[PDB]
Amino acid sequence: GAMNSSNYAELFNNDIKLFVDDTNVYRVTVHKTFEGNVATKAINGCIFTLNPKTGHLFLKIIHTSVWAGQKRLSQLAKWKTAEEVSALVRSLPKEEQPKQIIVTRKAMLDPLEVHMLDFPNIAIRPTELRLPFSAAMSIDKLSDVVMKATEPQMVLFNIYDDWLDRISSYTAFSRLTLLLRALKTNEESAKMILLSDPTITIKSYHLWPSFTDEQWITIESQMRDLILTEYGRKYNV
Amino acid sequence: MNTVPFTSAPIEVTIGIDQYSFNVKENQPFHGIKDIPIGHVHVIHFQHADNSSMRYGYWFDCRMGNFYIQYDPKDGLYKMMEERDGAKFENIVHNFKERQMMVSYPKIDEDDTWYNLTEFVQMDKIRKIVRKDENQFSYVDSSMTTVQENELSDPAHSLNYTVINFKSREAIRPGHEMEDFLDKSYYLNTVMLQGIFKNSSNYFGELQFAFLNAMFFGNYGSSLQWHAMIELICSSATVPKHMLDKLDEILYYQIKTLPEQYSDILLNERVWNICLYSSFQKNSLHNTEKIMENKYPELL
């Protein structure tokens, strides 16, 4: 059934699984019309489909053209997400197909289940975890490729850069969730922390700065401090 | 007006005949039920005083043969049997009627309740849902599972209701996933009505039979089937107007007849709230919505 703190290690076993997050699929700016009414203007979105074991990200860019002339876009977005995930699984060779897909939002379960009826051996699961994958659009290079897209496009990334050379998936996923939780809670502070020291660069083929092991400990500490402060302010405690 | 004579009543039992019921004492001189209206199916049902577990009974049509009940002290139940000897039968019933040993099917002249509950139910369709082809009558009880229930364990003793599953390839055309899931008209009209039932009369017959098995035997799988067939129509944007009108009448009489104290287990909150207040047909069931609101406002 549901993925939670109890079964957290299952993410890093040898069963291929994907997380699917649909929180950035349908994105709008709300604005005033000339007549003083409110209208939305969609901007480009993305499906965030992540192998938590390998760090492989299947970033399907959702171009604003997919919403042209469509009604009930927040509902369509869930079905569009399920159609694209289904398309992705069918495009993979059998031995690369996930055995499980975990949706970050429960509203994705029925749309994905219906789109995956051809795959009765692929388990579709919710999670009780509050995963910060919505902050994926706070990663500059992911945001950049989404906003520049002029057509539907799949872009492949390793969201762990080269980390798996030095750390386990479990540790790489904890670092990722800590960076995304920080970016989600206070984007300005989190981005300040990551770039401040100018000697530390992002390699052309990476998303995050090239930090030594010791520089990562310092960065991770600064991210936890950011998250606890903001939590104090949120709840005056 | 036909008769279902009884050999005897050796055990104390509540006897049902359609929507009516009588208490019979152990060894009470009871020899059956007379004046049963010709032209409808009927159900004769039983709850032992000693074991309020297992309600059970027999769907039958008096036009199809001469049926009697005899207690079997080995299997411990009242069994329906057919008497092929027409003149032995008439002679037994004549004696029992002369000795006034038979209760009279107690139909009020003005009262169309049974007709309204059984309008589309035919013995020939019952016998395909309940397979025991050597008998003209169909046994049902509280415990019998449905073919669908068995898929999720004795095939012979199953209720072979039409499988309905909203998250099945049968229900969802490839490339019409969102359309077919959110609007089940394809599944209702093409797969079920034209494909499997052939017409709305057969669909309604199965729906009505599922309700009566739910109500008279507390058959849980029957109740699931009744709700599934209601929900498939209510979740369809495109339903013939005559089907919507007739559904409103069917459901009205089902809700009218339901014992007030069984609404908690026999009515699915989600299905009814969805059918009356959210669905495509939320405004197509005036009679059903008014009786549900006035009789079961808590469920909603």
Curated annotation (Swiss-Prot), chain A:
Localization terms from the record: Nucleus
Complex formation: Component of the U4/U6-U5 tri-snRNP complex composed of the U4, U6 and U5 snRNAs and at least PRP3, PRP4, PRP6, PRP8, PRP18, PRP31, PRP38, SNU13, SNU23, SNU66, SNU114, SPP381, SMB1, SMD1, SMD2, SMD3, SMX2, SMX3, LSM2, LSM3, LSM4, LSM5, LSM6, LSM7, LSM8, BRR2 and DIB1.
Species in which this protein is naturally found: Saccharomyces cerevisiae (strain ATCC 204508 / S288c) (Baker's yeast)
Domain text: The MPN (JAB/Mov34) domain has structural similarity with deubiquitinating enzymes, but lacks the residues that would bind the catalytic metal ion.
Its job: Functions as a scaffold that mediates the ordered assembly of spliceosomal proteins and snRNAs. Required for association of BRR2 with the spliceosomal U5 snRNP, and the subsequent assembly of the U4/U6-U5 tri-snRNP complex. Functions as a scaffold that positions spliceosomal U2, U5 and U6 snRNAs at splice sites on pre-mRNA substrates, so that splicing can occur. Interacts with both the 5' and the 3' splice site, as well as the branch region. Has a role in branch site-3' splice site selection. Associates with the branch site-3' splice 3'-exon region. Also has a role in cell cycle.
Residue span of region RNase H homology domain: 7-237
Disulfide bonds: none
Organism domain of life: Eukaryota
Note: Present with 468 molecules/cell in log phase SD medium.
Protein name: Pre-mRNA-splicing factor 8
From Swiss-Prot, chain B:
Modified residues (Phosphoserine): S236
Pfam families for this protein: AAR2, AAR2_1st
Residues that bear Phosphothreonine: T257
Keyword Phosphoprotein: yes
Keywords, ordered alphabetically: Cytoplasm, mRNA processing, mRNA splicing, Nucleus, Phosphoprotein
The keyword Flavoprotein is assigned to this record: no
Protein localization: Cytoplasm; Nucleus
Main location: cytoplasm
PTM characteristics: Phosphorylated on serine and tyrosine residues.
GO biological process, one term: spliceosomal tri-snRNP complex assembly
Gene Ontology CC, one term: U5 snRNP
Annotated region (Leucine-zipper), positions in chain: 244-265
Function: Component of the U5 snRNP complex that is required for spliceosome assembly and for pre-mRNA splicing. Involved in splicing pre-mRNA of the A1 cistron and other genes that are important for cell growth.
Misc. comment: Present with 7330 molecules/cell in log phase SD medium.
Family: Belongs to the AAR2 family.
Quaternary structure and interacting proteins, as annotated: Heterodimer. Interacts with PRP8 (via RNase H homology domain and MPN domain), competing with BRR2 for the same binding site. Component of a U5 snRNP complex that contains at least the U5 snRNA, PRP8, SNU114, AAR2, SMB1, SMD1, SMD2, SMD3, SME1, SMX2 and SMX3, but is not a component of the U4/U6-U5 tri-snRNP complex.
Protein name as it appears in the record: A1 cistron-splicing factor AAR2
Encoding gene per record: AAR2
